[PDB]
Amino acid sequence: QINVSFEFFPPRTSEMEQTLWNSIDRLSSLKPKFVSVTYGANSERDRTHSIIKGIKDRTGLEAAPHLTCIDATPDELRTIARDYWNNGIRHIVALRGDLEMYASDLVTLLKEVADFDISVAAYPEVHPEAKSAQADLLNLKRKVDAGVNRAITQFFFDVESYLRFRDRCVSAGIDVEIIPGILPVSNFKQAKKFADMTNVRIPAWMAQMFDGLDDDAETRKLVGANIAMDMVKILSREGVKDFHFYTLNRAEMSYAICHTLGVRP
Amino acid sequence: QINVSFEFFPPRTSEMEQTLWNSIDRLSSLKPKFVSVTYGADRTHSIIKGIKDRTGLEAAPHLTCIDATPDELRTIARDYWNNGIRHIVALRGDLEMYASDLVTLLKEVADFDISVAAYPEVHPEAKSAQADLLNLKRKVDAGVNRAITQFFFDVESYLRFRDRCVSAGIDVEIIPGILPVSNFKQAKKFADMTNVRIPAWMAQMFDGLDDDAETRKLVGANIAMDMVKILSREGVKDFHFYTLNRAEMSYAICHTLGVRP
Amino acid sequence: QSLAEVQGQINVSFEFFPPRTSEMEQTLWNSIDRLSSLKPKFVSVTYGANSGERDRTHSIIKGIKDRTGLEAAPHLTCIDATPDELRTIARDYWNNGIRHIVALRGDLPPEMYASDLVTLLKEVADFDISVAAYPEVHPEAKSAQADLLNLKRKVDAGVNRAITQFFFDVESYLRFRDRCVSAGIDVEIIPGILPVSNFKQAKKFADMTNVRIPAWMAQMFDGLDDDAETRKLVGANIAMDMVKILSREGVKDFHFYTLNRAEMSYAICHTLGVRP
Amino acid sequence: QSLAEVQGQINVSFEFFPPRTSEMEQTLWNSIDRLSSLKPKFVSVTYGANSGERDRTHSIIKGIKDRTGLEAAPHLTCIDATPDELRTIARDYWNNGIRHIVALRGDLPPEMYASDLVTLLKEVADFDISVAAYPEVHPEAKSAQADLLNLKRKVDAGVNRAITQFFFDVESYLRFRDRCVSAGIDVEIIPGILPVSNFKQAKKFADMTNVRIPAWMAQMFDGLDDDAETRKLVGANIAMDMVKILSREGVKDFHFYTLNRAEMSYAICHTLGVRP
Numbered sequence A: 001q002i003n004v005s006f007e008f009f010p011p012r013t014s015e016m017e018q019t020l021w022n023s024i025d026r027l028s029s030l031k032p033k034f035v036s037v038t039y040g041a042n043s044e045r046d047r048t049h050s051i052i053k054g055i056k057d058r059t060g061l062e063a064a065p066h067l068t069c070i071d072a073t074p075d076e077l078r079t080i081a082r083d084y085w086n087n088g089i090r091h092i093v094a095l096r097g098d099l100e101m102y103a104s105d106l107v108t109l110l111k112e113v114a115d116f117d118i119s120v121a122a123y124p125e126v127h128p129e130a131k132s133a134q135a136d137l138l139n140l141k142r143k144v145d146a147g148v149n150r151a152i153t154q155f156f157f158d159v160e161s162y163l164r165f166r167d168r169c170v171s172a173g174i175d176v177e178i179i180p181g182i183l184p185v186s187n188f189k190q191a192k193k194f195a196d197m198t199n200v201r202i203p204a205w206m207a208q209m210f211d212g213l214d215d216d217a218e219t220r221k222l223v224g225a226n227i228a229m230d231m232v233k234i235l236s237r238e239g240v241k242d243f244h245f246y247t248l249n250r251a252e253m254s255y256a257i258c259h260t261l262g263v264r265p
Numbered sequence B: 001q002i003n004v005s006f007e008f009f010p011p012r013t014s015e016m017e018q019t020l021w022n023s024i025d026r027l028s029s030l031k032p033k034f035v036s037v038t039y040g041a042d043r044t045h046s047i048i049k050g051i052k053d054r055t056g057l058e059a060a061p062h063l064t065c066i067d068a069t070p071d072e073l074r075t076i077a078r079d080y081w082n083n084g085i086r087h088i089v090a091l092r093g094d095l096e097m098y099a100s101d102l103v104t105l106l107k108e109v110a111d112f113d114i115s116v117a118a119y120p121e122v123h124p125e126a127k128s129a130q131a132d133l134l135n136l137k138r139k140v141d142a143g144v145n146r147a148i149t150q151f152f153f154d155v156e157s158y159l160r161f162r163d164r165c166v167s168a169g170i171d172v173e174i175i176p177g178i179l180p181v182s183n184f185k186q187a188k189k190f191a192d193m194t195n196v197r198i199p200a201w202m203a204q205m206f207d208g209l210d211d212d213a214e215t216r217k218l219v220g221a222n223i224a225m226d227m228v229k230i231l232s233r234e235g236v237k238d239f240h241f242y243t244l245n246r247a248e249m250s251y252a253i254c255h256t257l258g259v260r261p
Numbered sequence C, D: 001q002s003l004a005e006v007q008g009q010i011n012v013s014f015e016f017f018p019p020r021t022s023e024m025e026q027t028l029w030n031s032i033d034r035l036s037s038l039k040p041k042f043v044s045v046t047y048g049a050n051s052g053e054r055d056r057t058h059s060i061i062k063g064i065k066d067r068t069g070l071e072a073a074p075h076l077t078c079i080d081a082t083p084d085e086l087r088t089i090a091r092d093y094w095n096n097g098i099r100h101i102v103a104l105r106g107d108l109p110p111e112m113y114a115s116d117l118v119t120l121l122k123e124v125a126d127f128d129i130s131v132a133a134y135p136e137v138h139p140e141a142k143s144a145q146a147d148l149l150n151l152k153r154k155v156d157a158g159v160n161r162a163i164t165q166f167f168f169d170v171e172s173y174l175r176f177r178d179r180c181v182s183a184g185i186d187v188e189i190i191p192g193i194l195p196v197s198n199f200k201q202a203k204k205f206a207d208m209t210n211v212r213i214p215a216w217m218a219q220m221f222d223g224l225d226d227d228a229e230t231r232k233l234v235g236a237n238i239a240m241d242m243v244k245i246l247s248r249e250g251v252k253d254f255h256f257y258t259l260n261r262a263e264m265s266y267a268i269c270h271t272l273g274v275r276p
């Protein structure tokens, strides 16, 4: 069967707060294996923790908060970890965060606290600060060996980048699943900003496909949905049985994509 | 590089009237090779002129052989030709004379640009696939510029037909008629009348979306965009869109084909 | 691997044009001697329609037959001659040993189409005949089916082979070859290969013939206007890749648009296993 | 498509050798000016071990720094010098602005292995260091694991990058790159590319370095001993294909064994999107 998960971010306005819960209600009927909530230091753990508790309380779904260790002391982290665990949060997305402690150190500290289910980040197009592609792979390996359950990739628009990366992970002896993070695109300007700051390559055919649509939201949605549906179709054919969606707190595109994958209520 | 045409139908309500004209405005900016208006086998003629005088686009009215005598047809044919209307979609008509007779008649009145219908999946009345094909050839041999197919969802069937056609000596392009589906129930119905097949994968694709208009449109746009993409790679450079008076889906599909303002 | 094993099973033909200067004349004969060592099935010499320089074409042909003993085929157009002239010209060729003709209509400056020329020629004698094909549709055709149907009409009049217009998108050719079968055309569809060293010139030919130039190719030649060497290396790479792919798809015949130059075509043939 | 979009994300480096004649000297500086316009991350100059011509190497280096302002890396071998000489030579480089060194052992005419040189150099200063790698195993290695383990030892001493021996079988490289990860080697494995125009010479280098030459390649150059032009076109095609494939597999860095010639490397870079 096909497994799916949805990623959300803490809303900063009443309007976005409403949008978020509407999307959670909608997407939850698809019985995702789990949902996660991002962390933004300048946009705090309490906002993240709050949403996580809300999801669990109203939907009963497994909710994984994203926890970063940059700027947090090991002692604080242990306290944080113990509190989430004692309150039913058994899945955590262990991250370093943007610059003392790397994600691998967080994974170790978390496993010392409890048998958490753990998800970590992987980069098909290499982390921007990595010493090299080879190093980035060895580091994911070390991170995995610390005790993780799965790796979720940064978004990508070149499906081949993902496939070659998966083969390299397998050759590297990394046994856990390399779940592709899918970014359905409706706002191309925003996606370009994301890709630029993450070293993700936006192929020419794609940039051309969105050319001239700056003020046409409806066409962007249709074009973006088509691109996303095609990508997951190719991934499925290539054996991918798990997908993680970067919903940006919006449900329509992801819901529709899951539908074409057979993931339905 | 790709030529596109948009088909509309006479609005039956005030709401649909507004919708049509807005779509006409929207779609016109794509400079289609021509637009056409269906004729229920009265208001068709007015819309054509309305379109012509409003956008300057070549508007081709549809004309049938239902409830019309050769004398009346020639009359209409003449009335149209003298009105700057030199392109006509010749059809027998939804139930005497066949479409082939209409074209010979029309050509007899003047050098008319003519579009006729083709049926990749065999016209319902036809005895056999071969008989219907031979019939198309005869209709074309009568003086047609291009054939426009009934909508379809199995690209394979369309392609084999296109192959059979040239093999049968038909010297015109078999332009695929594209039906962007946002309402599956309605399309399911259309297919029942037109004898068009709804592949299993398509039925499974829309299953459970009866009350999800939003997801239906995305799924539909995806199916149609994928279709024209496969078609374009097969050499097809002409598309006729059954817009049902709506602009957004066709507009978006055209965009992916490179047809933009 | 495949291109290596295919060595020895490929036929080739080279196309030349009547030189207009002493410089080009010397270049042409040098290319002829060099390419002759490859033992092409035949070579052909163009004739510009509406040029009135038909004397130059027949001249080069005789010269090639004299100097190399290879079968030389002149390109004959009909848009600029009458059926009687044509028959007269046809008779003269036959009696002089020129038994293979590339029957063409020629660009409009009509009364005759290539198919008429094919019929006319067959009435005169049992010529070996080659005709033009357009994977991307002849620019004047009303439709792709019409153009394709025209090719069948032409072939039915007595044609031994079709030689396509040059193309840069290999799929366009492969699809056309398949559509030719669907149309009942029974002759081999020989791809015409245009090795590119001068992109500006190829670009003009392309836009003049309705031939598409993919973006990746235009990208490859970008910034090379004043770099002839890099152009030749880039072009040879593109040409060699195209024939390798076509060869793997079954093509066993290639017609080269040499533009009177030998090096590029010579090297491409080499990679195809066509050597002295 | 892919090779087209990758344009602008590829780093390149060029390797030269001290000219032995006035002719080669002029050729070298011409190639340097031409290749300099491509803005390579760095260029390097070899030094024949046991040659005693180290003066020529440092000379060319200074000349390149003076004339182009590009980072120039000398190749330093240890099999023919003592630790003191080496440190002395190392100090002189550092004080003259030569902060990048290709640390090599050199062929046996021992007391030192490349890893010792890497340690020695790091004690003198914080040099940027490149070392040799062998996708097809160094000829003296007892086993592939030993050789691979040696590379790790070398890398652990303070290396910024590894540059492989040239190869013609792309899979050999891709597999090696993967085995390097399995061995815990954390530096990028930059493929060294040897464009071939002179096959007889490449053949000698190959058999001299344990590098394999596939049959299809040997087939491609068969019969071209006295045809330099076809050789260059055939070789450019092979080189361009190899980098296209490597580029699609993630390689973003290439080191070219130019043999002091610029045209082939220049054109290959062009197809990689590396332009002036």
Ligand SMILES: Cc1cc2nc3c(=O)[nH]c(=O)nc-3n(C[C@H](O)[C@H](O)[C@H](O)COP(=O)(O)OP(=O)(O)OC[C@H]3O[C@@H](n4cnc5c(N)ncnc54)[C@H](O)[C@@H]3O)c2cc1C
Binding pocket: A037, A038, A039, A040, A041, A066, A068, A093, A094, A095, A096, A097, A098, A099, A101, A102, A103, A104, A120, A121, A122, A127, A128, A129, A130, A131, A135, A136, A137, A139, A140, A142, A143, A152, A153, A154, A155, A181
């Ligand atoms: C699915 C996903 C979700 C994310 N969610 C968030 C979020 O909610 N909030 C947020 O702030 N950021 C988030 N990020 C972004 C992430 O925090 C940045 O990419 C960050 O720079 C690195 O985090 P990491 O967990 O990958 O760190 P690491 O795995 O530690 O990697 C970072 C770098 O250090 C190197 N490295 C790793 N381990 C070692 C080691 N032991 N020794 C030396 N070098 C090492 C790596 O090769 C790499 O270049 C997410 C990324 C993904 C792909």
Ligand SMILES: Cc1cc2nc3c(=O)[nH]c(=O)nc-3n(C[C@H](O)[C@H](O)[C@H](O)COP(=O)(O)OP(=O)(O)OC[C@H]3O[C@@H](n4cnc5c(N)ncnc54)[C@H](O)[C@@H]3O)c2cc1C
Binding pocket: B037, B038, B039, B040, B041, B062, B063, B064, B089, B090, B091, B092, B093, B094, B095, B097, B098, B099, B100, B116, B117, B118, B123, B124, B125, B126, B127, B131, B132, B133, B135, B136, B138, B139, B148, B149, B150, B151, B177
């Ligand atoms: C692009 C397009 C637009 C259309 N627009 C309209 C519209 O505006 N209004 C409307 O009423 N309908 C419209 N139709 C539908 C059409 O009118 C019906 O399908 C109708 O059944 C008549 O078909 P026809 O025009 O194909 O005529 P024909 O080609 O005359 O008829 C088809 C049937 O008759 C048989 N046949 C044809 N010629 C002969 C012959 N000489 N002898 C014996 N058998 C023969 C064929 O095999 C076939 O079964 C359209 C169809 C298409 C594809």
Ligand SMILES: Cc1cc2nc3c(=O)[nH]c(=O)nc-3n(C[C@H](O)[C@H](O)[C@H](O)COP(=O)(O)OP(=O)(O)OC[C@H]3O[C@@H](n4cnc5c(N)ncnc54)[C@H](O)[C@@H]3O)c2cc1C
Binding pocket: C045, C046, C047, C048, C049, C075, C076, C077, C102, C103, C104, C105, C106, C107, C108, C112, C113, C114, C115, C131, C132, C133, C138, C139, C140, C141, C142, C146, C147, C148, C150, C154, C163, C164, C165, C166, C192
């Ligand atoms: C291998 C090759 C070699 C060539 N060599 C030369 C040369 O030496 N000299 C020169 O001047 N040109 C040459 N040409 C170019 C060529 O002459 C032009 O492309 C010309 O415009 C058409 O020539 P054709 O022989 O294809 O004629 P046809 O096959 O007669 O012409 C094709 C055009 O007329 C249409 N057509 C055919 N029959 C009919 C009909 N009965 N009614 C209406 N339309 C019809 C076709 O579909 C098409 O658009 C060559 C082309 C090729 C591919």
Ligand SMILES: Cc1cc2nc3c(=O)[nH]c(=O)nc-3n(C[C@H](O)[C@H](O)[C@H](O)COP(=O)(O)OP(=O)(O)OC[C@H]3O[C@@H](n4cnc5c(N)ncnc54)[C@H](O)[C@@H]3O)c2cc1C
Binding pocket: D045, D046, D047, D048, D049, D075, D076, D077, D102, D103, D104, D105, D106, D107, D108, D112, D113, D114, D115, D131, D132, D133, D138, D139, D140, D141, D142, D146, D147, D148, D150, D154, D163, D164, D165, D166, D192
């Ligand atoms: C990019 C590149 C540039 C080059 N430039 C030059 C140049 O300018 N001048 C020149 O003379 N040569 C040059 N060479 C050739 C090179 O010097 C030879 O291949 C040499 O024989 C080994 O050098 P190395 O630096 O790999 O040494 P190492 O890595 O020390 O040597 C490799 C050999 O010794 C074995 N070995 C290593 N450590 C031990 C140990 N402790 N005990 C036993 N065996 C061990 C290895 O497995 C292997 O067989 C170059 C090679 C490359 C790939």
